[PDB]
Amino acid sequence: VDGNYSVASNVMVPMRDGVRLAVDLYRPDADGPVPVLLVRNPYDKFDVFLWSTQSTNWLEFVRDGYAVVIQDTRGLFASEGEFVPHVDDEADAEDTLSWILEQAWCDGNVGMFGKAYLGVTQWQAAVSGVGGLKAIAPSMASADLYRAPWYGPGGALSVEALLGWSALIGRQLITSRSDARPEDAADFVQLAAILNDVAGAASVTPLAEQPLLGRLIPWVIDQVVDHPDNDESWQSISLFERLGGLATPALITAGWYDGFVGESLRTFVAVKDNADARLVVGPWSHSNLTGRNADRKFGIAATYPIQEATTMHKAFFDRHLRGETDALAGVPKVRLFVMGIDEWRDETDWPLPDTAYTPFYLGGSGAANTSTGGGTLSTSISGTESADTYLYDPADPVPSLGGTLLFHNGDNGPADQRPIHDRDDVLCYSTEVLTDPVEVTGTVSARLFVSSSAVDTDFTAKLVDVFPDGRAIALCDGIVRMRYRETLVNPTLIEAGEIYEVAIDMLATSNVFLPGHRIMVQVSSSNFPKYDRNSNTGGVIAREQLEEMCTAVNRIHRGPEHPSHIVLPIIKR
Numbered sequence: 001v002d003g004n005y006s007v008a009s010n011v012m013v014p015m016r017d018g019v020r021l022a023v024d025l026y027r028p029d030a031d032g033p034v035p036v037l038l039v040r041n042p043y044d045k046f047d048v049f050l051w052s053t054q055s056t057n058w059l060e061f062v063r064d065g066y067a068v069v070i071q072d073t074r075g076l077f078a079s080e081g082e083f084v085p086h087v088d089d090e091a092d093a094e095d096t097l098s099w100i101l102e103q104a105w106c107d108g109n110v111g112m113f114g115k116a117y118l119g120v121t122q123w124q125a126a127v128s129g130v131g132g133l134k135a136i137a138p139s140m141a142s143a144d145l146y147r148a149p150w151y152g153p154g155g156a157l158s159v160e161a162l163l164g165w166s167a168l169i170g171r172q173l174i175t176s177r178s179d180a181r182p183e184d185a186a187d188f189v190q191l192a193a194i195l196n197d198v199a200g201a202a203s204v205t206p207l208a209e210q211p212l213l214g215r216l217i218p219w220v221i222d223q224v225v226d227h228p229d230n231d232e233s234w235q236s237i238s239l240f241e242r243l244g245g246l247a248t249p250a251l252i253t254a255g256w257y258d259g260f261v262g263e264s265l266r267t268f269v270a271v272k273d274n275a276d277a278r279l280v281v282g283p284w285s286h287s288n289l290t291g292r293n294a295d296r297k298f299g300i301a302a303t304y305p306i307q308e309a310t311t312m313h314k315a316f317f318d319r320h321l322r323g324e325t326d327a328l329a330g331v332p333k334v335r336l337f338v339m340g341i342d343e344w345r346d347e348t349d350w351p352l353p354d355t356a357y358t359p360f361y362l363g364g365s366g367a368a369n370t371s372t373g374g375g376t377l378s379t380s381i382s383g384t385e386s387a388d389t390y391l392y393d394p395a396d397p398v399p400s401l402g403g404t405l406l407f408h409n410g411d412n413g414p415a416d417q418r419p420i421h422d423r424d425d426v427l428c429y430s431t432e433v434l435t436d437p438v439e440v441t442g443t444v445s446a447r448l449f450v451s452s453s454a455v456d457t458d459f460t461a462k463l464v465d466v467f468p469d470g471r472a473i474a475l476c477d478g479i480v481r482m483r484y485r486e487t488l489v490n491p492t493l494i495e496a497g498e499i500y501e502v503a504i505d506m507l508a509t510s511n512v513f514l515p516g517h518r519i520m521v522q523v524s525s526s527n528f529p530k531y532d533r534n535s536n537t538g539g540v541i542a543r544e545q546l547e548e549m550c551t552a553v554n555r556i557h558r559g560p561e562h563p564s565h566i567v568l569p570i571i572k573r
Contacts, residue, residue, distance in 0.1 A: 004029035005062045009046075010078050013071070015095045022078035023096075026059075026068040033107035035321040036067045036100050039114050040093060040121035042085075043172065044077045045070040054115050054289055055139060057310040064314065066321075067105055071096060073121070077176055084219050086120070086145055086237045093125035101132040109321035113137035113313060115253075116260065116286065120145070123239040123267070126248045135320035137313055139253035140286065142263035143239040143270075146230045146488070149259045149406065153505035155228070155484030155491070156458060156531035157542070159202045160400070161259060162224055163213065163529075164407025167194040167201075170216040187212065198408035199399070202529040205549075207542040225542045230488035243270040250277050251316045253309075255284035256339065256476070257413025259406045262507040265443070268350055278316065279334040279350050280309070281510065285404070288411035293402075296414035296473055298342050338441065339414075339475075340465065340512030352571055355442045359565035360519065362429050362448075362558040371421035371472070375429035377519055377566070385559035390425040390524075392457060394549040397526035397533045398426060402474040403462070404507070408529050417464055417472040417522065427556060430466060430520035434513055441510040442569025444476050448523065449501050449562035454536040454552035455493045456483045460527045461504045461566065465511055466518035477522075478506035479531050483538070493538045499557055506566075521566050525554050 005028045012020040024045050028034055037058070043050055048070070052058065062068050074092055075083030100106050110132045112122040119141020126136055142148040149161045170191045174184045190212050194201040207225060214221045227233050240263075250271050254264035261281075268279045282305075283291065283298050291302030318327035332346035362368070363382035368375030369390060400408065402415025420426055446461040462477035483491035485502045494500060513519050526533050535541045535549040558564045 001029050002065070003063045013096055013099045015074070015092055019074065019081040021071055021074060021080070021092060021096065023069050023071045026062045026070070027105055028062055028065045028067065030065060033105050034065055034067050035109040035111070035317065036069060036106045037061060037111045037113060037317065038096065038100060038125075039068070039070045039112065039118060040073055040089065040096070040125070041070055041114065041118055042073045042076050042083070044176070045072045046077070051115060051118065053306065054304065055309075056113060056313050057306060058113065060310050061314060061317070066317065069100060076172075089121050089124040090127060093121060094128035094130060097125060097128065097130040097133055101130070108132055109134050111135045111137070111317050111321050113139070115139040116141055123243070126246055127239050127242045133248065135249040135251070135317060137251035137316065138264075138267070140255055140258045140260050140264055140284075142260045143243055143267050144263055145237050146234040148263035150224050151228070151230070152479065152531070153262065153488075154479040155230075155481040155488050156479045156534075157225070157228065158259070158406070158530065159207065159532040160198045160408035160529035161406040162220065163194060163201050164198050166213045166217050166220045167191040170213065173216060187216070195407065199529045202532065205546040206544060207532060228540070228542065229491060240266070240270065243267060244274070246271060247275045249275045249316070249320050251313060252277060252279050254279070254281045255286070255289075256281065256337075256509055257283065257285035257402070257404055259286050259404045261404060262505070265350065265508050276320070276328070278312075278331070280312070281335070282337045283339055283413070285410055285413040286406050288413065293412050293414050295416040295471055298337070298339065301344065302337055302342065336441065336510050338439070338510045338512060340437075340514055351442045351569065354571070356570040356572065358568050358570045359563070360431070360568055362521075362556065362564040364429065368427045368429055369424045370426065371418075371428045373428055375427060377429045377431045377521060381563050382559045385561060387555050387557045388427050389553060389555045390427065391551055392425055392525035392536065392554050393551045394526070394533045394535055395546060397528035398423060398460070398524045400527050400530035403477050403530060405530055414473045414475070417462075417474055418470065421472065425524050425526075427523040428520060429523070430518045433518055434515050436515060438513045438519065439511070439571040439573070440513065440568045441571045443508045444506040444567065444569065445478070446504040446506060446521070446566045447501060448504065448564045449499050449557040451497055451499045451555045451557065452482065452494065452552050453496050453554070454550060455496060455538040456481070456534060457536050457552045457554055458482065458525045458531070458534040459502065459504060459554070460522075460524045461506055462522040463506060463509065463566065464520040464522060465513055466520050468516045472520060475511050476507045476509040477527065478504045479527060480504045481534060499562065523556055525552065
């Protein structure tokens with residue numbers, strides 16, 4: 001009977017080391033083997049409602065004749081073994097694919113889908129070399145775990161991401177326990193207190209002392225906090241350098257305010273030349289896919305389009321797992337939600353073909369401190385040599401507000417920035433009010449001439465759309481930790497007072513700045529707890545006490561010989 005299926009629970013799958021991983025089998029009521037879709041899930045294979053609304057109506061796949069396998073990853077819930085994030089998923093996925101391909105009901109075609117960690121596990125599957133894996137669909141995910149979500153291209157720790165995710169893993173473990181432990185009730189309450197105040201949890205110094213999280217999941221310290229350089233421990237789990245050698249079609253989703261967005265987009269660039277890659281980017285954050293935010297509404301068309309996504313995934317799997325050569329007819333290569341005009345729009349490529357990477361130079365009379373300063377942005381080089389100066393005090397960092405926050409207030413990506421506009425350490429530069437629209441769609445970076453009183457510090461850059469009513473809406477932002485200014489791998493300190501030209505990777509966006517709006521950039525030296533705060537000492541930041549940290553006098557240089565600017569991907573149509 002087409003449309004009908006059965007579900008077998010806790011089928012145990014043996015890995016190479018003898019440890020057995022538990023799976024659930026959703027198999028169509030049909031004769032002969034079928035194509036198979038695999039989901040590798042650390043959040044309980046039984047709990048399908050937890051994530052499915054953020055992905056696909058995948059029971060449609062089963063009703064249409066796909067088998068679907070959902071697996072507890074190693075050491076979690078019904079699976080045997082010990083859980084350590086990332087380190088076992090390459091080998092475990094390879095063995096799981098091998099097992100599936102051996103099964104009577106598998107016709108030799110396997111795909112995958114899923115979001116975030118369930119997207120990462122697909123890149124880890126794809127590097128295995130198993131020919132039966134015909135396509136993946138990693139949503140809002142990453143193939144380089146240092147660059148997202150634990151650190152980033154600027155070499156700062158994503159501390160709210162780390163502590164928030166670790167606290168949810170901890171609550172998961174406690175809830176899933178066989179026999180409740182005497183300390184379970186108190187631990188569970190303490191993990192909730194972290195999640196109710198992530199910035200406060202991130203404020204304890206030394207950062208590396210995590211009595212609760214370090215006990216429940218030692219990897220928090222042993223791997224992430226203790227390895228601030230993009231060293232061999234990170235490279236061991238990175239998939240990115242191997243993506244270029246793959247020929248695996250990938251249906252890649254991203255969100256402009258999602259923590260993974262930079263790495264999601266880079267996976268598309270890395271695989272598009274060697275197989276059929278597809279890109280969908282909506283205006284979502286990791287936990288807010290509704291299109292509605294406190295001070296910014298994108299319209300109901302911006303809500304994560306689960307039905308259209310289900311249709312697109314099925315067409316994708318029909319093409320690559322069923323060999324239906326016309327199944328993707330009419331489907332665009334790239335589909336972006338273009339903010340400002342707040343409309344979905346199809347494109348032929350990412351980056352967009354006719355992107356004009358355009359410098360907008362920092363300028364202005366007087367000091368650019370606060371939003372009532374004199375800071376300007378212009379496509380012409382500034383005529384007079386100037387500099388803006390501020391005190392960065394680690395005890396008083398610029399609070400994170402929107403952006404790509406994950407767990408600390410991670411449901412308000414396009415946040416109004418006015419609550420921090422009067423801070424003296426927030427330098428503001430903006431264009432005149434626009435009379436014609438300016439579209440900025442692509443990757444975004446800044447190039448700043450900076451100096452510091454300290455031997456290490458951070459610099460941040462944030463792109464903002466200023467609305468006529470005064471809302472200053474965050475778009476994309478980035479950070480550079482100065483010791484990593486040239487390499488994330490082999491950091492060196494800087495000389496106090498010397499001027500450096502540094503790049504700040506500000507991820508990506510798609511926004512039409514409409515007439516009556518302004519383009520604005522904020523520059524500072526902190527963005528906390530989105531990123532941990534630089535101690536301004538050159539020390540091992542995560543091991544320092546707040547008392548041991550220093551303030552830094554930091555300076556942006558701007559003018560003819562120091563043409564600090566933001567590089568905007570200008571689209572003109």
